Amino acid sequence: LDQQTINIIKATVPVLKEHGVTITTTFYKNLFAKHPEVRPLFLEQPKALAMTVLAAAQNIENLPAILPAVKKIAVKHCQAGVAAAHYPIVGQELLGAIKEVLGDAATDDILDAWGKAYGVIADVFIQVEADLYAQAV
Amino acid sequence: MLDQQTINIIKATVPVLKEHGVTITTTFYKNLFAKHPEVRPLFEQPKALAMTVLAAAQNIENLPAILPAVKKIAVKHCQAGVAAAHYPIVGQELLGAIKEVLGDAATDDILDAWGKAYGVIADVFIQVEADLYAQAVE
Ligand code: HEM
Ligand code: HEM
């Protein structure tokens, strides 16, 4: 990640958190409508994805700080059947939500920095889970 | 965070440092123990430091790939009494060794990039170990 990227992330995350309810609801709505194939893996509706990504993003410069959380989430993802190829899909629907919320602030550079950040974050869960799947055998 | 020229220097030069491994490792431990006798007790001689840092450095763009190893080394470090403030000293002596081997190739930008890389690497261990020290008290 280049610094302008990190700068965008650091500066905008608080705006996204402000609109959390909206990003979260829009995300899950679109995820499930556009990708019914993931429905089976999941008042008890999931809610934590988008805010967790925001939280990691907030920690983008020191991801090892959030390992204790990442590790336990990894355990549930490996239990549920989450695959590496699922990540780009969740990323797309998350970015679409960030896009709707930022509205006119939704610069391509900004959107592009969010794409990059999610990737980096997703890269951590993907490797940790690969490692846990291997340990299981 | 780490810029490309730095990642570039690391990726390009690690293979050269690994070729001189025996020399960096032996210069490193010798200097460490001679210059910082206070750490002696925490440690049939250790040998894995410098080569492990090189390996991590080689994985500089995807540090999560080496977590299974980092996690296990963390456990031994917390068992031994390793502290965050120890990191800068191990870094100083690793850097002086790198400098000796690179000889005339030891440019300031090269030494600087290694300094930065060591920093990033150490921060991972420092953070996992802090988390493990807490986990021991709850
Ligand atoms: C970096 C990206 C992701 C983050 C930050 C993340 C975050 C989380 C969190 C915080 C939880 C709940 C943990 C709990 O409290 O036990 C969770 C559960 C879950 N996540 Fe993710 N996740 C990510 C990627 C994905 C992907 C790519 C999928 C694939 C569909 C997915 C599917 C699931 C499922 C199926 C569960 C358990 C759900 C349930 O039984 O309701 N996640 N995730
Ligand atoms: C990022 C830097 C570091 C790396 C890559 C690293 C790597 C390692 C490795 C691979 C081991 C052996 C683990 C085993 O095979 O169980 C080890 C053990 C050890 N390291 Fe580190 N270490 C680092 C930093 C430090 C620091 C800052 C100190 C403090 C002086 C230190 C002191 C120790 C000690 C005391 C042990 C155990 C030795 C024994 O078993 O007698 N390490 N380290």
Tab-separated table of C-alpha atoms and ligand atoms in Angstrom:
chain	number	residue	atom	x	y	z
A	1	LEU	CA	0.000	0.000	0.000
A	2	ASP	CA	1.280	3.426	-1.003
A	3	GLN	CA	0.904	6.340	1.416
A	4	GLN	CA	-1.739	8.253	-0.512
A	5	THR	CA	-3.704	5.072	-0.256
A	6	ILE	CA	-3.141	4.818	3.435
A	7	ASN	CA	-3.900	8.474	3.756
A	8	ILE	CA	-7.241	8.058	2.074
A	9	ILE	CA	-8.064	5.110	4.252
A	10	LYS	CA	-7.093	6.876	7.483
A	11	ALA	CA	-9.043	9.968	6.572
A	12	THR	CA	-12.264	8.371	5.311
A	13	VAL	CA	-12.841	5.441	7.633
A	14	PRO	CA	-14.378	7.713	10.223
A	15	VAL	CA	-16.811	8.934	7.586
A	16	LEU	CA	-17.722	5.386	6.685
A	17	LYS	CA	-18.159	4.385	10.381
A	18	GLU	CA	-20.487	7.319	10.685
A	19	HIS	CA	-22.679	5.722	8.101
A	20	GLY	CA	-22.177	2.193	9.380
A	21	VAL	CA	-25.857	1.160	9.574
A	22	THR	CA	-26.224	2.017	5.998
A	23	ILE	CA	-23.134	0.351	4.649
A	24	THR	CA	-23.864	-2.786	6.716
A	25	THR	CA	-27.516	-3.152	5.549
A	26	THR	CA	-26.805	-2.355	1.938
A	27	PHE	CA	-23.885	-4.778	1.936
A	28	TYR	CA	-25.819	-7.795	3.236
A	29	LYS	CA	-28.815	-7.009	1.115
A	30	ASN	CA	-26.809	-6.926	-2.091
A	31	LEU	CA	-24.548	-9.810	-1.105
A	32	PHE	CA	-27.451	-12.163	-0.640
A	33	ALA	CA	-29.532	-10.977	-3.547
A	34	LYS	CA	-26.626	-11.037	-6.037
A	35	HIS	CA	-24.930	-14.220	-4.794
A	36	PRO	CA	-27.614	-16.596	-3.538
A	37	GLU	CA	-25.003	-19.366	-3.702
A	38	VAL	CA	-23.449	-18.165	-0.482
A	39	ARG	CA	-26.678	-18.050	1.383
A	40	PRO	CA	-26.411	-21.586	2.754
A	41	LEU	CA	-23.091	-20.850	4.475
A	42	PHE	CA	-24.768	-18.512	6.882
A	43	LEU	CA	-34.093	-12.243	13.894
A	44	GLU	CA	-30.601	-13.824	13.693
A	45	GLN	CA	-29.095	-12.140	10.603
A	46	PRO	CA	-25.257	-11.618	10.320
A	47	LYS	CA	-24.144	-7.988	10.910
A	48	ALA	CA	-20.501	-7.848	11.599
A	49	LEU	CA	-18.643	-7.850	8.235
A	50	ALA	CA	-18.571	-4.292	7.064
A	51	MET	CA	-17.764	-2.833	10.499
A	52	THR	CA	-14.998	-5.366	11.024
A	53	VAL	CA	-13.406	-4.384	7.728
A	54	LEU	CA	-13.614	-0.774	8.840
A	55	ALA	CA	-11.968	-1.621	12.095
A	56	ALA	CA	-9.135	-3.488	10.358
A	57	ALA	CA	-8.775	-0.573	7.974
A	58	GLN	CA	-8.464	1.747	10.854
A	59	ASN	CA	-5.507	-0.514	11.795
A	60	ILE	CA	-4.157	-0.798	8.302
A	61	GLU	CA	-0.645	0.215	9.322
A	62	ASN	CA	-0.378	-2.391	12.033
A	63	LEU	CA	-2.544	-5.370	11.152
A	64	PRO	CA	-0.737	-7.640	13.562
A	65	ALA	CA	-2.567	-5.640	16.339
A	66	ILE	CA	-5.820	-7.224	15.319
A	67	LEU	CA	-4.616	-10.821	15.055
A	68	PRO	CA	-6.405	-12.059	18.154
A	69	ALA	CA	-9.650	-11.053	16.487
A	70	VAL	CA	-8.590	-12.270	13.017
A	71	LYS	CA	-7.623	-15.600	14.482
A	72	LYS	CA	-11.002	-16.313	16.042
A	73	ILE	CA	-12.963	-15.081	13.035
A	74	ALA	CA	-10.739	-17.500	10.957
A	75	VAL	CA	-11.923	-20.355	13.100
A	76	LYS	CA	-15.532	-19.612	12.340
A	77	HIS	CA	-14.863	-19.042	8.606
A	78	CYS	CA	-13.057	-22.453	8.334
A	79	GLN	CA	-15.945	-24.031	10.209
A	80	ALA	CA	-18.486	-22.512	7.791
A	81	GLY	CA	-16.699	-23.416	4.545
A	82	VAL	CA	-15.400	-19.990	3.509
A	83	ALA	CA	-13.079	-20.108	0.467
A	84	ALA	CA	-10.444	-17.771	-0.978
A	85	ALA	CA	-12.559	-17.235	-4.047
A	86	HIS	CA	-15.400	-15.876	-1.794
A	87	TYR	CA	-13.276	-12.868	-0.853
A	88	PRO	CA	-13.525	-10.961	-4.171
A	89	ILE	CA	-17.240	-11.315	-4.084
A	90	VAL	CA	-17.577	-9.890	-0.578
A	91	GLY	CA	-15.136	-7.154	-1.627
A	92	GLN	CA	-17.271	-6.169	-4.587
A	93	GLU	CA	-20.455	-5.836	-2.611
A	94	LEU	CA	-18.637	-3.972	0.178
A	95	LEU	CA	-17.171	-1.456	-2.286
A	96	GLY	CA	-20.573	-1.006	-3.899
A	97	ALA	CA	-22.000	-0.069	-0.439
A	98	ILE	CA	-19.056	2.313	0.348
A	99	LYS	CA	-19.858	3.818	-3.067
A	100	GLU	CA	-23.512	4.401	-2.352
A	101	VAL	CA	-22.691	5.963	0.973
A	102	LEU	CA	-19.944	8.265	-0.053
A	103	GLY	CA	-22.191	9.616	-2.720
A	104	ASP	CA	-20.504	12.633	-4.362
A	105	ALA	CA	-17.403	12.109	-2.230
A	106	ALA	CA	-17.064	8.736	-3.932
A	107	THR	CA	-13.964	9.534	-5.916
A	108	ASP	CA	-12.469	6.840	-8.080
A	109	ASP	CA	-9.196	7.393	-6.275
A	110	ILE	CA	-10.997	6.944	-3.005
A	111	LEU	CA	-12.923	3.909	-4.237
A	112	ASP	CA	-9.707	2.591	-5.620
A	113	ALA	CA	-7.926	3.045	-2.314
A	114	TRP	CA	-10.750	1.120	-0.602
A	115	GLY	CA	-10.416	-1.704	-3.101
A	116	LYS	CA	-6.747	-1.920	-2.295
A	117	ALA	CA	-7.275	-1.848	1.431
A	118	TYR	CA	-9.902	-4.553	1.412
A	119	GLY	CA	-7.510	-6.720	-0.645
A	120	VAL	CA	-4.744	-6.383	1.876
A	121	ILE	CA	-7.078	-7.148	4.672
A	122	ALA	CA	-8.669	-10.048	2.844
A	123	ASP	CA	-5.100	-11.363	2.165
A	124	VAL	CA	-4.582	-11.808	5.914
A	125	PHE	CA	-7.729	-13.795	6.546
A	126	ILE	CA	-7.142	-15.889	3.381
A	127	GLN	CA	-3.629	-16.964	4.497
A	128	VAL	CA	-4.563	-17.557	8.122
A	129	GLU	CA	-7.543	-19.755	7.085
A	130	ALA	CA	-5.457	-21.658	4.504
A	131	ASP	CA	-3.113	-22.451	7.360
A	132	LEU	CA	-5.952	-23.515	9.628
A	133	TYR	CA	-7.510	-25.742	6.892
A	134	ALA	CA	-4.054	-27.451	6.561
A	135	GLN	CA	-3.750	-27.913	10.260
A	136	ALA	CA	-7.077	-29.702	10.309
A	137	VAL	CA	-5.560	-32.582	8.230
B	1	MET	CA	4.462	1.922	5.052
B	2	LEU	CA	7.375	0.226	3.357
B	3	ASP	CA	7.905	1.866	-0.001
B	4	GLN	CA	8.719	0.007	-3.274
B	5	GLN	CA	12.375	0.977	-3.551
B	6	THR	CA	12.809	-0.527	-0.118
B	7	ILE	CA	10.864	-3.665	-0.936
B	8	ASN	CA	12.869	-3.763	-4.110
B	9	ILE	CA	16.168	-3.512	-2.314
B	10	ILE	CA	15.122	-6.201	0.109
B	11	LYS	CA	13.908	-8.649	-2.569
B	12	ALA	CA	17.039	-8.130	-4.635
B	13	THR	CA	19.617	-8.320	-1.877
B	14	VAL	CA	18.329	-11.066	0.468
B	15	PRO	CA	19.692	-13.754	-1.854
B	16	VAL	CA	23.112	-12.170	-1.508
B	17	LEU	CA	22.859	-12.021	2.322
B	18	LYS	CA	21.668	-15.700	2.413
B	19	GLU	CA	24.701	-16.734	0.423
B	20	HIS	CA	26.848	-15.172	3.123
B	21	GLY	CA	24.656	-16.603	5.866
B	22	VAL	CA	27.359	-18.287	7.930
B	23	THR	CA	29.184	-15.041	8.151
B	24	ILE	CA	26.255	-12.855	9.109
B	25	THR	CA	25.005	-15.342	11.742
B	26	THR	CA	28.421	-15.750	13.472
B	27	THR	CA	29.241	-12.030	13.372
B	28	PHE	CA	25.808	-11.267	14.635
B	29	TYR	CA	25.899	-13.503	17.745
B	30	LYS	CA	29.440	-12.665	18.506
B	31	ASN	CA	28.721	-8.971	18.487
B	32	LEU	CA	25.428	-9.317	20.257
B	33	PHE	CA	26.923	-11.107	23.242
B	34	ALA	CA	30.103	-9.077	23.425
B	35	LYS	CA	28.306	-5.682	23.195
B	36	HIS	CA	25.215	-6.552	25.321
B	37	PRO	CA	26.249	-8.956	28.037
B	38	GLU	CA	22.974	-8.165	29.805
B	39	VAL	CA	21.041	-10.461	27.440
B	40	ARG	CA	23.299	-13.436	27.833
B	41	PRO	CA	21.368	-15.120	30.614
B	42	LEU	CA	18.128	-15.170	28.599
B	43	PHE	CA	19.808	-17.659	26.404
B	44	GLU	CA	25.198	-25.629	22.080
B	45	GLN	CA	24.781	-21.997	20.957
B	46	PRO	CA	21.802	-20.189	19.291
B	47	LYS	CA	22.054	-19.891	15.451
B	48	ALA	CA	18.634	-19.177	13.996
B	49	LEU	CA	18.167	-15.395	14.315
B	50	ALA	CA	19.698	-13.868	11.273
B	51	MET	CA	18.545	-16.605	8.910
B	52	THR	CA	15.015	-16.303	10.256
B	53	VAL	CA	14.988	-12.537	9.662
B	54	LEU	CA	16.215	-13.152	6.125
B	55	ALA	CA	13.445	-15.654	5.571
B	56	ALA	CA	10.802	-13.251	6.828
B	57	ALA	CA	12.361	-10.526	4.670
B	58	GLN	CA	12.042	-12.765	1.728
B	59	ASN	CA	8.316	-12.880	2.646
B	60	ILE	CA	8.212	-9.194	3.126
B	61	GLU	CA	5.131	-8.621	1.007
B	62	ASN	CA	3.063	-11.332	2.615
B	63	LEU	CA	4.096	-11.600	6.249
B	64	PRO	CA	0.965	-13.451	7.156
B	65	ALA	CA	2.412	-16.435	5.221
B	66	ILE	CA	4.988	-16.921	7.981
B	67	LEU	CA	2.617	-16.646	11.000
B	68	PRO	CA	2.682	-20.297	11.883
B	69	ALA	CA	6.423	-19.952	12.461
B	70	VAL	CA	6.170	-16.492	14.102
B	71	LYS	CA	3.569	-17.815	16.490
B	72	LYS	CA	5.778	-20.625	17.694
B	73	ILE	CA	8.903	-18.437	18.017
B	74	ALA	CA	6.659	-15.976	20.030
B	75	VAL	CA	5.928	-18.711	22.506
B	76	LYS	CA	9.646	-19.344	23.109
B	77	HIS	CA	10.380	-15.609	23.297
B	78	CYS	CA	7.672	-15.027	25.941
B	79	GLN	CA	8.896	-18.069	27.834
B	80	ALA	CA	12.478	-16.646	27.798
B	81	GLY	CA	11.564	-13.096	28.894
B	82	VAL	CA	12.072	-11.241	25.604
B	83	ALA	CA	10.999	-7.577	25.722
B	84	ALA	CA	10.045	-5.007	23.092
B	85	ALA	CA	13.026	-2.932	24.043
B	86	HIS	CA	15.302	-5.868	23.172
B	87	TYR	CA	14.328	-5.571	19.460
B	88	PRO	CA	16.269	-2.446	18.643
B	89	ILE	CA	19.377	-3.936	20.043
B	90	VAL	CA	19.135	-7.165	18.026
B	91	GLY	CA	18.418	-4.929	14.994
B	92	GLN	CA	21.557	-2.882	15.568
B	93	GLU	CA	23.810	-5.891	15.700
B	94	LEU	CA	22.096	-7.610	12.690
B	95	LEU	CA	22.605	-4.396	10.671
B	96	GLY	CA	26.289	-4.141	11.594
B	97	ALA	CA	26.786	-7.733	10.411
B	98	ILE	CA	24.898	-7.071	7.078
B	99	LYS	CA	27.162	-4.097	6.655
B	100	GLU	CA	30.310	-6.180	7.143
B	101	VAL	CA	29.343	-8.701	4.534
B	102	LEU	CA	27.998	-6.344	2.002
B	103	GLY	CA	31.390	-4.688	2.148
B	104	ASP	CA	31.642	-2.176	-0.750
B	105	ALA	CA	28.072	-2.955	-1.770
B	106	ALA	CA	26.892	-1.783	1.633
B	107	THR	CA	25.299	1.427	0.414
B	108	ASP	CA	23.497	3.777	2.706
B	109	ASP	CA	20.201	3.195	0.919
B	110	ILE	CA	20.691	-0.524	1.185
B	111	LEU	CA	21.511	-0.409	4.888
B	112	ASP	CA	18.510	1.890	5.365
B	113	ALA	CA	16.128	-0.397	3.602
B	114	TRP	CA	17.336	-3.307	5.775
B	115	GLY	CA	16.855	-1.201	8.831
B	116	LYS	CA	13.286	-0.544	7.757
B	117	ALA	CA	12.595	-4.100	6.958
B	118	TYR	CA	13.940	-5.372	10.269
B	119	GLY	CA	11.648	-2.807	11.920
B	120	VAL	CA	8.569	-4.129	10.174
B	121	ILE	CA	9.486	-7.657	10.924
B	122	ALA	CA	10.227	-6.992	14.577
B	123	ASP	CA	6.911	-5.114	14.990
B	124	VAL	CA	5.061	-8.320	14.122
B	125	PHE	CA	6.845	-10.320	16.785
B	126	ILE	CA	6.576	-7.490	19.359
B	127	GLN	CA	2.814	-7.336	18.813
B	128	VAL	CA	2.080	-11.077	18.866
B	129	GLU	CA	4.257	-11.508	21.996
B	130	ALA	CA	2.530	-8.617	23.777
B	131	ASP	CA	-0.717	-10.348	23.057
B	132	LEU	CA	0.662	-13.611	24.358
B	133	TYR	CA	2.004	-11.978	27.577
B	134	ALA	CA	-1.559	-10.617	28.218
B	135	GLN	CA	-3.093	-13.881	27.452
B	136	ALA	CA	-1.033	-15.357	30.272
B	137	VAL	CA	-2.658	-13.002	32.890
B	138	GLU	CA	-6.193	-13.553	31.445
C	1	HEM	C1	-11.896	-9.587	5.454
C	1	HEM	C2	-13.144	-9.965	5.124
C	1	HEM	C3	-14.094	-10.546	6.202
C	1	HEM	C4	-14.274	-10.119	7.464
C	1	HEM	C5	-13.627	-8.885	8.127
C	1	HEM	C6	-15.205	-11.034	8.066
C	1	HEM	C7	-15.729	-10.859	9.326
C	1	HEM	C8	-16.538	-11.751	9.990
C	1	HEM	C9	-16.949	-11.667	11.391
C	1	HEM	C10	-16.441	-10.558	12.356
C	1	HEM	C11	-17.740	-12.733	11.627
C	1	HEM	C12	-18.462	-13.280	12.868
C	1	HEM	C13	-17.633	-13.993	13.942
C	1	HEM	C14	-18.250	-14.360	15.268
C	1	HEM	O1	-18.618	-13.341	15.960
C	1	HEM	O2	-18.094	-15.583	15.622
C	1	HEM	C15	-17.867	-13.508	10.371
C	1	HEM	C16	-18.569	-14.691	10.227
C	1	HEM	C17	-18.831	-15.277	9.002
C	1	HEM	N1	-18.325	-14.827	7.795
C	1	HEM	FE1	-16.950	-13.453	7.477
C	1	HEM	N2	-15.593	-12.044	7.160
C	1	HEM	C18	-14.923	-11.721	5.988
C	1	HEM	C19	-15.008	-12.447	4.818
C	1	HEM	C20	-15.981	-13.375	4.541
C	1	HEM	C21	-16.197	-14.052	3.267
C	1	HEM	C22	-15.312	-13.816	2.009
C	1	HEM	C23	-17.260	-14.854	3.471
C	1	HEM	C24	-17.899	-15.799	2.442
C	1	HEM	C25	-19.207	-15.855	2.256
C	1	HEM	C26	-17.705	-14.804	4.854
C	1	HEM	C27	-18.711	-15.532	5.463
C	1	HEM	C28	-18.904	-15.679	6.838
C	1	HEM	C29	-19.769	-16.658	7.473
C	1	HEM	C30	-20.538	-17.782	6.706
C	1	HEM	C31	-19.654	-16.462	8.786
C	1	HEM	C32	-20.381	-17.202	9.943
C	1	HEM	C33	-21.872	-16.783	9.807
C	1	HEM	C34	-23.060	-17.312	10.569
C	1	HEM	O3	-23.121	-18.545	10.849
C	1	HEM	O4	-23.958	-16.440	10.726
C	1	HEM	N3	-16.840	-13.903	5.470
C	1	HEM	N4	-17.128	-12.869	9.400
C	2	HEM	C1	12.544	-10.394	14.587
C	2	HEM	C2	13.599	-10.709	15.345
C	2	HEM	C3	13.741	-12.136	15.914
C	2	HEM	C4	13.691	-13.315	15.258
C	2	HEM	C5	13.376	-13.626	13.770
C	2	HEM	C6	13.940	-14.312	16.254
C	2	HEM	C7	14.039	-15.632	15.923
C	2	HEM	C8	14.234	-16.656	16.821
C	2	HEM	C9	14.169	-18.085	16.526
C	2	HEM	C10	13.878	-18.744	15.155
C	2	HEM	C11	14.359	-18.726	17.675
C	2	HEM	C12	14.391	-20.243	17.953
C	2	HEM	C13	13.049	-20.911	18.279
C	2	HEM	C14	13.017	-22.405	18.511
C	2	HEM	O1	13.604	-23.045	17.564
C	2	HEM	O2	12.217	-22.802	19.435
C	2	HEM	C15	14.583	-17.717	18.728
C	2	HEM	C16	14.757	-17.964	20.072
C	2	HEM	C17	15.175	-17.013	20.974
C	2	HEM	N1	15.260	-15.671	20.712
C	2	HEM	FE1	14.703	-14.684	19.110
C	2	HEM	N2	14.215	-13.726	17.493
C	2	HEM	C18	14.115	-12.358	17.293
C	2	HEM	C19	14.267	-11.374	18.277
C	2	HEM	C20	14.831	-11.604	19.509
C	2	HEM	C21	15.155	-10.632	20.536
C	2	HEM	C22	14.884	-9.122	20.325
C	2	HEM	C23	15.726	-11.312	21.537
C	2	HEM	C24	16.231	-10.841	22.913
C	2	HEM	C25	17.538	-10.796	23.173
C	2	HEM	C26	15.676	-12.725	21.249
C	2	HEM	C27	16.026	-13.754	22.096
C	2	HEM	C28	15.700	-15.100	21.925
C	2	HEM	C29	15.952	-16.127	22.911
C	2	HEM	C30	16.447	-15.870	24.368
C	2	HEM	C31	15.517	-17.254	22.367
C	2	HEM	C32	15.501	-18.669	22.980
C	2	HEM	C33	16.907	-19.307	23.039
C	2	HEM	C34	17.012	-20.625	23.761
C	2	HEM	O3	16.149	-21.505	23.492
C	2	HEM	O4	17.956	-20.720	24.583
C	2	HEM	N3	15.069	-12.862	20.008
C	2	HEM	N4	14.508	-16.470	18.168
